């Protein structure tokens, strides 16, 4: 039969992301000489809304150590950071909300945002509004540092990998009901064409594993193996258990 | 001894000598004569009766003119082929793909006077 919806997305045609309005990628500074020996000062010149992003960005200008010129970077704004505020970035810099320090240089239980997976990658972990990571240990002979990411997973990465002190702002966003279809409508309007969603069980067979039959029903287990093949993976993919979750979740 | 001293880490293409063309033979054997002399610019008078009026009333000569010619080339060509001085030159493409030049002479010339010393009427 046909090619199912979830296969059509990969060609990206009507499914690429609606982007005209976005401020620009958000990154930490390039890990230059200043930032890995000393520290370098900047001013947040503005904190600003990004289209289809939860948390506001923070525009921070720095002096170019090598040319006479201002070089402005785009951060995700940690809560509490503000216009005018002075931001410090470097190994030898000071442990305050807003600054950017290498996970090696902050004590355990420090709380940081927008952290790198490898040093230099200008920030990958914990960027969504409200999220952060916690340093939960160090191993100095190897300079790994151990973090717990928003998911619960605990990675270990270079103590050189940089992070920014605090949590990312606009948290709480998801506690309030969308209420009507219009509000989701405009929500995905500035993200990507993923809304609304036809249930495959409302489709015909050509369309989808779940399509067809004289009452709507999946007809077979909707738990699909990892070893499945495109055109087949719809449902609960690789599901290692299923059903209503009872009792405290929380990874140990 | 020892090394250069580049203060830039960008390496660029060395600005190197550019020789000019000194052919072993002539490009095309004989250059083309002028492809748009005045006898090719201005092709005929236009002697439509509503044209003949601009002449009588407006001190203006209407010519069918080369499609390849511009206001410059039209103005010079009139000036040369007729003694006449030109004030300005309006032009337009007729609907049979040919160009019409409305040529205003300066106040010193009587275009009507010209018109019959060129022939038409």
């Amino acid at each position: 039969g046909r090619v199912i919806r979830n296969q059509r997305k990969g060609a990206g045609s009507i499914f690429t992301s609606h982007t005209r309005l976005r401020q620009g990628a958000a990154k930490l500074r390039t890990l230059d000489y200043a930032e890995r020996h000393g520290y370098i000062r900047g001013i947040v010149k503005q904190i600003v809304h990004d289209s289809g992003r939860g948390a506001p960005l923070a525009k921070v200008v720095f002096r170019d150590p090598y040319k006479y010129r201002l070089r402005e970077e785009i951060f995700i704004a940690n809560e509490g950071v503000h216009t005018g505020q002075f931001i410090y970035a470097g190994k030898k810099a000071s442990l305050n909300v807003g600054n950017v320090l290498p996970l090696g240089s902050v004590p355990e239980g420090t709380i940081v945002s927008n952290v790198e997976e490898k040093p230099g990658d200008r920030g990958a972990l914990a960027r969504a509004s409200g999220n952060y990571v916690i340093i939960i240990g160090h191993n100095p002979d190897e300079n790994k540092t151990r973090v717990r990411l928003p998911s619960g997973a605990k990675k270990v990465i270079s103590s050189d990998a940089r992070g920014v002190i605090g949590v990312i702002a606009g948290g709480g966003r998801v506690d309030k009901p969308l209420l009507k279809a219009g509000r989701a409508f405009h929500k995905y309007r500035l993200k990507r064409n993923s809304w609304p969603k036809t249930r495959g069980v409302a489709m015909n067979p050509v369309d989808h594993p779940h399509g067809g039959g004289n009452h709507q029903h999946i007809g077979k287990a909707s738990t699909i193996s990892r070893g499945a093949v495109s055109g087949q993976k719809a449902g609960l993919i690789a599901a290692r258990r299923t059903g209503l979750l009872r009792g405290s979740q929380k990874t140990q | 001894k020892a090394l250069k001293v580049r203060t830039s880490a960008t390496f660029r293409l060395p600005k190197t000598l550019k020789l000019a063309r000194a052919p072993k033979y002539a490009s095309k054997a004989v250059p083309h004569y002028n492809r748009l002399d005045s006898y090719k610019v201005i092709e005929q008078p236009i002697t439509s009766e509503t044209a003949m009026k601009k002449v009588e009333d407006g001190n203006i000569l209407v010519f069918q003119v080369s499609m390849k010619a511009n206001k410059y080339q039209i103005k010079k060509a009139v000036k040369e082929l007729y003694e006449v001085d030109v004030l300005k030159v309006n032009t337009l493409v007729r609907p049979n793909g040919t160009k019409k030049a409305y040529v205003r002479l300066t106040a010193d010339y009587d275009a009507l006077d010209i018109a019959n010393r060129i022939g038409y009427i």
């Binding site: 000393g38 520290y39 002096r63 150590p65 090598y66 | 001293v5 580049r6 203060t7 390496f11």
Partner: protein, 233 residues
């Protein structure tokens, strides 16, 4: 002193645009430059096998300088000099009736690879010089092995170009003497002796020694320092 003033700039992170410095160590060289450097590195990180490793041991600046000194007295004819000789003999041979021997026996250096090889096989060289470049090394790698067998004293010498000079070609790859004027037999036997001592004699032992396996120095330091302290507490 006067209305002039000391104002030292402070170039110390987060202040004063850094000054112009020499970034030569940093520049983003062209691929072709990057590549010929890295080829030289690669050939030295690897363990190079003995029959190539026998090159790199190149004749020393001294002994060599005096080997070109003898050899440069044996250049081949020039165009003028061969024009010159012909008339001198087109003249005499045709009328004075010289047996095509209105010309003195030429003594010059012997060159051209395939030429030099057959000379050696046929036991006529007395001193082969092999050049230490030559990029398809194969053209030449067997030349030591070959000269050892023909009991022909040889020397790997720096300058594939400089062997070209002594024979009026841009490069030359090999250069050999076979004949020599009595007034030079001596000079040669001296050279042949020194040279035989830095190569032909050392041959079998050179043959057992691989080369390369040589760290870059960011890695060497990582090893002198690591293997200083780890043992010496």
């Amino acid at each position: 002193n006067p209305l002039t003033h000391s104002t030292p700039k402070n170039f110390g992170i987060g202040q004063a645009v850094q000054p112009k410095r020499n970034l030569s160590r940093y520049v983003k060289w062209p691929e072709y430059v990057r590549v010929q450097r890295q080829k030289k590195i690669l050939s030295i990180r690897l363990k190079v096998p003995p029959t190539i490793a026998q090159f790199q041991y190149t004749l020393d600046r001294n002994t060599a300088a005096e080997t070109f000194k003898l050899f440069n007295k044996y250049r081949p004819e020039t165009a003028a000099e061969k024009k010159e000789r012909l008339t001198k003999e087109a003249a005499a041979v045709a009328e004075g009736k010289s047996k095509q021997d209105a010309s003195p026996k030429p003594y010059a250096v012997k060159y051209g690879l395939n030429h030099v090889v057959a000379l050696i096989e046929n036991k006529k060289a007395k001193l082969v010089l092999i050049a230490n470049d030559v990029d398809p090394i194969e053209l030449v790698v067997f030349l030591p092995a070959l000269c050892k067998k023909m009991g022909v004293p040889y020397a790997i010498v720096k300058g594939k170009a400089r062997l070209g000079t002594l024979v009026n070609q841009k490069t030359s790859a090999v250069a050999a003497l076979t004949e020599v004027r009595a007034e030079d037999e001596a000079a040669l036997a001296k050279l042949v002796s020194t040279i035989d001592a830095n190569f032909a004699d050392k041959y079998d032992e050179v043959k057992k020694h691989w080369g390369g396996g040589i760290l870059g120095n960011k890695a060497q330091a990582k090893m002198d320092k690591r293997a200083k302290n780890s043992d010496s507490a």
